[PDB]
């Protein structure tokens, strides 16, 4: 296992690709323009990254359409797409240390998180979706003796995948795993905040046997190359993870253009509900802390509203505070670090503005509240807890996307449910109770795509993942993620 | 069987409800405004129908939300919803002769059509959907021993259904069936061109045991109450059948509103591909004629592009022409009538303007081509055929929505596919051939939601129905229709 | 509601068919032999029932094969079979009062039982099975592009169903429902102890539109016509509910015959596990009493082993005892009667001999324990409880098939499972506890086909039913029941 | 690629294990007895193989029961059983040349068949079933709001797998892949004719991470160790592939003992039906030859009745004869050989007795008929064709299990169907036609588990495989094979 010094040497010794990837080749943007990729770790210049626009989009869509029409991947045998997808995942694992290090330098998460959560997680999404292609079965209808009716699925065609920066490789693999498996071509627009891992893996896909043009990568700004894709006339489906504001704008784009399919995964204000009869109080405290502190609160499913029953609130809130103190911001290149940098100064000041709004709304600060380690030139905020929060307050309604917990109270399960669902979101939620009926009945009433019971951030590749309401449409991971990339056909045959 | 005279008297003795239906009662629009419901049969004024606006949408959606939250329907046991759903169908079949009379009078299709296709059709969508409720199963994932991972479906909440006028009852039941069966509340916006059946079955649902507020009906204009419903912020899902141009608009409204779910059934330019080696040319010719004549050619899955292998086109065309002669417009209240009125003056002049375009385009008119029965006080076009159409032509590329055939020819099976897929649409297509290989391979390359082989207008309630590309997203009929009215939840339980 | 007097007259005025049913007509056995059908209510002679033998099996199976091969049923469209199947159910509900009277008179269960459980129960198995026919889908495999791989189901052919006497109509419908719905032909051998309902619904099926020969009924003895059917070489599948000792025999016959398929529903010694922390002790006590009293304890899923946490056994037992007092044998033709006659003199002396064994075994009798109502001319045992039973005891290990409770105690949840799984059986079990973890983990370790939690006699038509180990193979009810009446075919088509 | 001399050197240099494997260790039979393993290639002594009996069975079942109860594999996480199963398959591929060579020396098939069909095929069955564990989902019922009903599958417990000698490693992997995946313990009784590969892989499983006792291997005679397993009281399910005679006797064993589950895969007389409109006549001829010649006719799905339409029979039968001549018996250690030895002299003389019976029945010999290469001390029979065969004849009814083709005629498809189904078997069948309707309609009418169209021996791991009628119960390969190793449980929970 590598020391801190070991990692800082590796970061020095990287040659970092910054070019786009189109038709099996790395390429500049047609303008030749670039944008600067700056690390949140120290502030250094990682690379000069190609800044793509509509022309670069049009080139990539033509490469996607061409490759798809050729059938070189979309009609390649399903046992062979399995093999190739599994090889693709293993090449992520082969160069895990390079890819993890790129992910830490690019958006600022702890190297030990990247090495042990992100890169394994993205490979997992690829290899699992690969294992599943030939385990899937389409349907025959019950038809009269002179009819045979097939209901089959086929690749939609060309998929645009616009992903965010909080889990750059993992989120993109969550889109690529199912989309690439079902035979589609994918044009992949990573975040401007985190272009480095999507850029590197394009060569890795080619080397695994993905045919040229089946996976092109277009780094650049959302309002440029991203808009262009969402607005393109030859793009069939767009998949997306990011701000509820942009997801909504994507829908408009689709209706303004070719009426493409739009699948969104937007934000969340996920309630974490601890009941007085929780089986292990310490586990819930540890989990409540981990729910807001992990990946410096830049998590869509962050447990950002802690919902406690009064009977235990006085005993519980110190337990949470003590757990949350084990989560200390640090040098993201240090393997012992578990809280990293916020992605950029912009993210840092939104977080600090919300903390202020916590005071202004009337809540009470009980831990954190400050930016630390500014001597580094990095951007870090200590995890922060607010108490006496009321669900109408700005820090209970609006997604903060930082390590900032709100704590509310309730007396009955009917109340807890009502407060948990008093949000435009529905991405995740948690229930802690040892009572069988209360456990299941509360899971039913929670309008959230993911409901964890006696644990937080649960699920593996078998669990679908996505939101209710303004939190998204569709589900990533699992067999259901495939449905966003396929189209049902009814072949009815007279005999 | 009832005679012409019989229906003429029955029509005269109908008493027609025109009101909207909210919270278990008939009602006016808040404004008190109405619009004249005019029958294309002879100008007869059927009734003065409520002209609802945004104020009424808000009343209805408030009603829906209360009903849904109360659980009277949404948490009523599956098997009980099933029985209710089947009774609902039963009441359609009980009032079949009135409902069919309303259909024919409001939008001008033949009464024998209405009695024999629409009412049984919409009834079955209600009953088959109810039959399947308790036959469904949600999933249990392969988890480690200390986990229980449930993957379940829940109703989204309140569903807005905006439905077209070509099949007023049945198109609505395609939505009501699954949407009501999954336990949602529905606000149903019928066509201003055809409100009568939707208005009517509202009472019928109450009587079947549907609770007040679970199904509310709002007659009125697309650009008033229809646009308000898709812009409403407490409407979780919108489902829509109709024009591609308006379907695009709903995607935009959703983006502008609450990021609600948007399922679209839109336009169509479906190809009918007849190979020389087709088993029965007579059968292919009668069905080619039926494919464009039935329901006045106002069918989204109409076979408006007839693609013929040149090697038989000199022989096949007269068989199509002669077959089409048996489809003759007449009194829609005559049981003998197989072609009815067009829906209004507006619709007739689109059809007539496109026939004019055909001559402009360079096409040869070989059958029909005129407006008929001007004496009636009603709107009628003869089934019309254009020969020598080139796929780039206007009457080939654009949907006409009347009895207008475009006849194209092809030298290879590959040419047949290029031409078939050379459209922004993908609702349906058909393939006539007795070759086992040619049939299935051609079916695969057709980017259409429904592919009929050696038949036209194939499938029953077990076959999904919907488009590729700009013809829509999602499927009506079958078990897949249920997906557009539910939301997936992953309940991961640590043990 | 009909009165005691009412049923007494109705019974007296019944005219009872006793004949067998082959090829659409009632008939005698070839021999002309009959056997006396004697009512356990008072010795009354209901009718002289056809005593069929191998000659009749061959006639019936010849009939079945012709019907099946003709296709009148086996290749009739799914949706048409569905309607027929539902009408069949309809005719059971139409003649519910006669059918129930027959059930109660033939095998001596309370008329309120028959009217309210058996007839609706068997009716629903017929209707729910018919409802699901067209809701099923067969599969399409992920193949290379030049292949089409269908995976479909077809009816096996002619099914022999030999059914027990504890639930004569419903147990038969559990087989008829799916077996008829998948389109097989059935030869149904009711119990010699209870032929009347099976004989009767044969007419009813003809009238529902079941073709002649598709359902044939052969009353008679297990060791004559029953053994012949399972030994017959044109019978593709045999399905059987009844004794473990006879179920073993059918496996042997199949080996000796045509290697036909053998699906078994057999014996039971199901455990009822009551933890101290159960939510409602009253609810657990009433249901423990119901679990052994209902239907005279002649239930395979009867809760004959009541496993109690010692920490509540001194408190819980009187609640079970007192509850059991409300179950009192009486006139089975009295609507007030909740415990009926035992099925015959033979059955009564097994129950009485096992009660004697209980005293021999070392158990303490705390309730009941006697034969009752000797004056009636009929066979009755009081619901009986033994306390201090050790799991090795005879009355613990062997099925008694009467109202006889054995009460055991346990110190740990692990002990509760050891004792529960310490039996050759695995039909059912239940677990009372309010702990979320204890409930689900205990449910997993119970090697039983049905596990009921915080309730007894759980499930509806959607839940599979059948044993682990020597209680059987395969499942009745749900969609899985259909698997025992179909055969899978892989049609791989090269293109 | 290895030469013939290269392989004969390797066969000299093998140390060959002949011991049983029980509880992670190789072990003698409790008697110390052995039997001689003699190669059909030259006649040499391969090893002295442990001859197991009931005591060795009892030891192995205790090891299986113990390992299963410990949960060390049956409750190990499904993603980890996937990993282990895939590692197990890769160790087959790592030592493919040793394992293929053992398979060729032990039962006499061509080394190039073993290396390229058998060993890849068995690894494929293991790795595929491994990939599929966490792609499988159990079910939640549609239940009232106060009920949650799970339908889950669990490992049956202890599985006995008795496999034949025609594909020793592949057939055993077809049982092991699904049985080991679902968590069961497997006791594996290979053929006495082919013990070597099952013996070797036991170490390979241990080395892949299969826990000790989860896979024990018991070589020895069917009437000894095999009978004992089938008769054992603590064996839950028996799976089997072999003679219809023994399969039937296994059923008797199960009923004589513990009423265990019995899954059988017995013989076949598979019709290969070539129609005059077959798309490629030469392909059908080549396939018809390959259908009987491949693996020297020792194939259950061997195309042993060629069904030809008269119109082409005179043109077709020479084409088959010419193809069949390219299939020449040879030294099984030669890589160019494609027909090997019959397994033993006993097999050789059954084949020769049937060839004689061909003449006696009245058929006419047109190719082969003789034993050749006796100078070798090996046992070889040249592929043989009989013409003018009638379905009543002994070589058209009785399975030969040699390279012996029967050829019959027909004039209509109704006739062909009738002759194809005029058999007690139903394992496979083939249809050759370019006509769409005839292709599908004939596949429907064929009572066979596998129906190939325009190809023979089709299917991959996605296609189930098993028989109708006396040809077996259940299906190997695909997701359905898992059902023989699991048990359904209905967990119904009141809330
Ligand atoms: N198409 C198919 O599925 C196959 C059919 N066969 C048929 O079987 C013969 C050749 O193969 P065999 O191995 O002799 O079939 P078989 O049924 O005699 O042998 C199958 C396996 O069980 C056997 N066995 C025999 N008696 C047993 C008993 N009393 N209890 C338990 N197991 C017992 C053997 O030990 C072997 O491991 C014929 O030549 C024939 O064609 C054989 C293999 C495959
Ligand atoms: O079971 C058999 O008799 C052999 C067999 C079935 N399917 C096969 C595919 C490839 C090679 C051999 C077989």
Author numbering:
A (entry chain C), B (entry chain A), C (entry chain A), D (entry chain C): 3 to 497
Paper's wording?
AldA from PtoDC3000 was determined to function as an indole-3-acetaldehyde dehydrogenase through comprehensive metabolic, biochemical, structural, and in planta analyses. AldA was shown to be essential for synthesis of the phytohormone IAA and as a factor contributing to the virulence of PtoDC3000. As with other ALDHs, AldA retains the invariant active site cysteine (Cys302) required for formation of a thioacyl-enzyme intermediate in the reaction sequence and a conserved glutamate (Glu267) that serves to activate a water molecule for hydrolysis of the intermediate.
Enzyme assays using the AldA C302A, E267Q, and E267A mutants showed no detectable activity above background rates in assays using up to 1000-fold higher amounts of protein compared with wild-type AldA. To further examine the reaction mechanism of AldA, the AldA C302A mutant was crystallized in the presence of NAD+ and IAA. The 2.85 Å resolution X-ray crystal structure of the AldA C302A mutant in complex with these ligands was solved by molecular replacement. The overall three-dimensional structure of the AldA C302A mutant is a tetramer with each monomer consisting of an N-terminal NAD(H) binding domain defined by a canonical Rossmann-fold, an interdomain linker, a β-strand oligomerization region, and a C-terminal mixed α/β-domain that includes the catalytic cysteine and the aldehyde substrate binding site. The AldA C302A mutant structure is similar to that of the previously reported wild-type protein with a 0.24 Å2 r.m.s.d. for 497 Cα-atoms in the monomer. NAD+ was observed bound in the N-terminal NAD(H) binding site and IAA in the C-terminal substrate binding site. The nicotinamide half of the coenzyme is bound with the ribose oriented toward Gln349 and the nicotinamide ring pulled away from the catalytic site (defined by the C302A mutation) by contraction of the coenzyme structure.
